[PDB]
Amino acid sequence: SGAIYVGNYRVVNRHLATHNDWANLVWEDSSRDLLVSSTTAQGCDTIARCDCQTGVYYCSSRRKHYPVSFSKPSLIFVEASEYYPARYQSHLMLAVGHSEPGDCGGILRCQHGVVGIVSTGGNGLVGFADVRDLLWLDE
Numbered sequence: 001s002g003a004i005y006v007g008n009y010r011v012v013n014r015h016l017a018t019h020n021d022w023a024n025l026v027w028e029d030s031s032r033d034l035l036v037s038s039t040t041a042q043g044c045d046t047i048a049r050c051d052c053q054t055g056v057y058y059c060s061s062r063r064k065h066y067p068v069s070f071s072k073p074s075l076i077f078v079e080a081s082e083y084y085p086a087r088y089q090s091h092l093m094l095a096v097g098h099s100e101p102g103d104c105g106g107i108l109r110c111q112h113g114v115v116g117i118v119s120t121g122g123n124g125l126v127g128f129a130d131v132r133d134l135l136w137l138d139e
């Protein structure tokens, strides 16, 4: 689990969104595994606006932050699970790292701020849903 809290927005994995998230919906995109809801309180996270390919992510199944090299946001096949029909997830970045059910929502960050959240795992791979192109999160 986990979310990004920027301004009056809460960014979560679409597959983990709560009823309150759907009842206060700002934007959602199944192809990206992202959903954004509105918040009453202002958040403290800042979004990175860059093309970094190195950063650090939080892995809840290890209680650890790991430094990683990750690919550029791309259209990558994701295998079927309880949340999606095996398919093509867009704006996804891959790295070598631990990710097991329970880890989605962990933040990936670089020197500029938050880059994205854990969205995939397995195989010593971790996939991140990018948020750097969502410029409206800053206003």
Ligand SMILES: NC(=O)[C@H]1CCCN(C(=O)C2(c3ccnn3C(F)(F)F)CC2)C1
Pocket: 015, 033, 078, 080, 081, 082, 083, 084, 089, 099, 100, 101, 102, 103, 104, 119, 120, 121, 122
């Ligand atoms: N974004 C996706 O399509 C996810 C949806 C869940 C399935 N996805 C996964 O990679 C797996 C999974 C199942 C439960 N949790 N996780 C994860 F992400 F933490 F690793 C490994 C099988 C793709």
Ligand SMILES: [Zn+2]
Pocket: 048, 049, 050, 051, 052, 110, 111, 112, 113
């Ligand atoms: Zn950066």
